[PDB]
Amino acid sequence: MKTWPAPTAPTPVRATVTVPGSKSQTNRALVLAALAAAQGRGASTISGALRSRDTELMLDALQTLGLRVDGVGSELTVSGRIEPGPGARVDCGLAGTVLRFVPPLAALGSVPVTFDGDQQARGRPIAPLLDALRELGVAVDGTGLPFRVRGNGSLAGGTVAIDASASSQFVSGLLLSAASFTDGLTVQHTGSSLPSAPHIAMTAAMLRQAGVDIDDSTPNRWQVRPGPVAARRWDIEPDLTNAVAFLSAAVVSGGTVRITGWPRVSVQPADHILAILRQLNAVVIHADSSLEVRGPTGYDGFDVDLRAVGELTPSVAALAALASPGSVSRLSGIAHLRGHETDRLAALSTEINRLGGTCRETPDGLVITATPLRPGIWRAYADHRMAMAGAIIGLRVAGVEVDDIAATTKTLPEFPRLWAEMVG
Numbered sequence: 047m048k049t050w051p052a053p054t055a056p057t058p059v060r061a062t063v064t065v066p067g068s069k070s071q072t073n074r075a076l077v078l079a080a081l082a083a084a085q086g087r088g089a090s091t092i093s094g095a096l097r098s099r100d101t102e103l104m105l106d107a108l109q110t111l112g113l114r115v116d117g118v119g120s121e122l123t124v125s126g127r128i129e130p131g132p133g134a135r136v137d138c139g140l141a142g143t144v145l146r147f148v149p150p151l152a153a154l155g156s157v158p159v160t161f162d163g164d165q166q167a168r169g170r171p172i173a174p175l176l177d178a179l180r181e182l183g184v185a186v187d188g189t190g191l192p193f194r195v196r197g198n199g200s201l202a203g204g205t206v207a208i209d210a211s212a213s214s215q216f217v218s219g220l221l222l223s224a225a226s227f228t229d230g231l232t233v234q235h236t237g238s239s240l241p242s243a244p245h246i247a248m249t250a251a252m253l254r255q256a257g258v259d260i261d262d263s264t265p266n267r268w269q270v271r272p273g274p275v276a277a278r279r280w281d282i283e284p285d286l287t288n289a290v291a292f293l294s295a296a297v298v299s300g301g302t303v304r305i306t307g308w309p310r311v312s313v314q315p316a317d318h319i320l321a322i323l324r325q326l327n328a329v330v331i332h333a334d335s336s337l338e339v340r341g342p343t344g345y346d347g348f349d350v351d352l353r354a355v356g357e358l359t360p361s362v363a364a365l366a367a368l369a370s371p372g373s374v375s376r377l378s379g380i381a382h383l384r385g386h387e388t389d390r391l392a393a394l395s396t397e398i399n400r401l402g403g404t405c406r407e408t409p410d411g412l413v414i415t416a417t418p419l420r421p422g423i424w425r426a427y428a429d430h431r432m433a434m435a436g437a438i439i440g441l442r443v444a445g446v447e448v449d450d451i452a453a454t455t456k457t458l459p460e461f462p463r464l465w466a467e468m469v470g
């Protein structure tokens with residue numbers, strides 16, 4: 047494969063960028079639309095849906111379950127029934143959301159569904175969710191990929207305790223399908239260190255939009271009452287996490303980047319994002335239905351807690367590597383990143399240090415000392431966000447090339463074109 051040379055920014059980046067839809071929101075809306083259709087409520091349309099590998103894997107997974115998903119652009123319509131064919135096999139790719147959200151849904155059918163994924167997915171956490179499904183009476187063969195859920199046409203539900211410290215998606219996946227369980231579900235996360243609170247909250251918010259009653263008033267416990275899932279039209283927001291990659295260009299170059307269609311009230315962790323950019327002394331404003339970020343003339347080291355927003359880690363680590371020389375930054379709260387698309391702590395450390403940097407992995411994150419970088423080959427590890435972090439680095443370091451820019455298809459297939467258009 048040819049490398050992708052990361053363009054440099056010898057002068058401030060100035061651009062207006064449109065990012066496509068949220069992966070997290072698109073994939074929840076697909077699941078909820080599938081539940082509504084399966085319950086007999088008719089077809090649902092998702093407007094502004096992301097089209098990426100993760101959402102294609104999700105729509106394919108729904109079609110493997112017997113549903114129909116129409117649309118060649120950003121407008122997707124879901125209709126039909128859960129009626130999987132003999133030996134139905136869901137391909138999970140490297141999509142955690144398919145791996146974690148689809149097994150519950152499948153446990154609603156009367157036909158066994160097998161789940162497989164990419165080689166690299168087989169390393170990611172899954173066993174605690176499979177055990178929770180067994181406790182709820184679903185027959186599940188296997189403790190990792192490939193595994194088979196042997197649905198018999200209903201799932202009883204009730205109460206279950208789970209260790210979700212490795213992934214919030216274990217909670218979200220149970221919550222999405224719970225309204226269709228005979229007695230609903232009460233899920234209790236046991237212990238501590240539950241990452242990605244905003245994504246669990248996203249799940250709860252979208253459930254409420256579909257008319258599901260969920261009680262999230264006590265931390266680490268959720269109660270979903272049995273009931274209908276409404277067929278509705280979904281309006282998907284831009285993906286704010288991917289927007290950060292583009293906004294980071296403003297930050298490192300002292301430029302100005304605007305993101306179109308930025309929501310003033312969001313189901314995504316907008317407030318956490320904007321606060322982090324402001325830590326670096328970027329100026330952030332809402333104007334003309336867009337978000338504008340003006341980078342500072344320079345920035346020093348920062349300490350940032352990423353427990354709630356761990357998917358920002360690659361971009362944030364790139365920012366830390368590009369702080370003023372000798373700056374020390376500490377990224378914390380992110381032990382769970384060892385279980386992501388790749389072990390992102392290990393991968394970021396390797397790649398930064400290969401460029402001459404100083405990144406030390408810690409028990410819960412990274413300590414990054416900004417030092418002069420040099421040319422090299424930034425490896426993506428089949429991880430969209432590793433690829434985009436190398437692009438950020440390359441704005442400020444000539445001769446950086448990403449091995450596999452196409453890893454960005456996971457959530458942002460047009461990244462190369464959008465990035466080129468931004469840098470001009």
Ligand SMILES: O=C(O)C1=C[C@@H](OP(=O)(O)O)[C@@H](O)[C@H](O)C1
Pocket residue numbers: 069070071142143212213214215218241242245246356357382
């Ligand atoms: O539910 C979701 O849509 C996601 C939740 C988070 O997972 P973890 O809680 O496993 O980190 C996030 O990192 C992921 O990219 C998307």
